[PDB]
From a paper:
To gain further insight into the structural conversions in pore formation, we chose pleurotolysin (Ply), a MACPF protein consisting of two components, PlyA and PlyB, from Pleurotus ostreatus. Previous studies have shown that PlyA binds membranes and is required to recruit the pore-forming MACPF protein PlyB to the membrane surface. PlyA and PlyB together form relatively small and regular pores in liposomes. The membrane attack complex/perforin-like family (MACPF) proteins form the largest superfamily of pore-forming proteins identified to date.
The 1.85 Å X-ray crystal structure of PlyA revealed a β-sandwich fold, unexpectedly related to the actinoporin-like family of pore-forming toxins. Previous studies suggest that actinoporin-like proteins interact with membranes via one end of the β-sandwich, with the N-terminal sequence responsible for forming the pore. Both forms fitted adequately into EM density, placing either the PlyA N-terminus (N-dimer) or C-terminus (C-dimer) in proximity to the membrane surface. Also, mutation of Trp 6 (W6E), located in the PlyA N-dimer interface, reduced membrane binding and led to 100-fold lower pore-forming activity.
Residue numbers in the entry: 2 to 136
């Protein structure tokens, strides 16, 4: 259902380019900003280079009237280091469960990734701002 939703805002707060790769929704769909009725494909964002002080916004929700939510993964990669993984992200805003998941993993010490705005308890995962900085 549309009630299972997340908005991911990736803001490059550093001075070096970051890139999005392997954007893979596994449940639900991606949609246009402020418009859940307009499906957008992952290819719209796949490989986008986020330059210093730019943002990239991804909107994901459960399919219309479906007893299923939104789940997926993506990577942030370093385009200046042969697309070396920066961090791996996993999101889940499931239908008929009070627990959402937002997991960030990885081991690239040249980067600092901060996130906030998530809601793990009941209803939507919310609007998550992910700030990226290459140290």
């Amino acid at each position: 259902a549309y009630a299972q939703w997340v908005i991911i805002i990736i803001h490059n707060v550093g001075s070096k380019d970051v890139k999005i790769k392997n954007l893979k929704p596994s449940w639900g769909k991606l949609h246009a900003d402020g418009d859940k009725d307009t499906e957008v494909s992952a290819s719209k964002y796949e490989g986008t280079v986020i330059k210093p002080d730019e943002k990239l916004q991804i909107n994901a929700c459960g399919r219309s009237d479906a007893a299923e939510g939104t789940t997926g993964t993506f990577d942030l990669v370093d385009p200046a280091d042969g697309d070396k993984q920066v961090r791996h992200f996993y999101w889940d805003c499931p239908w008929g469960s009070k627990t959402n998941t937002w997991t960030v993993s990885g081991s690239n010490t040249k980067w600092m990734i901060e996130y906030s705005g998530q809601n793990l308890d009941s209803g939507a995962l919310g609007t998550i701002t992910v700030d990226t900085l290459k140290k």
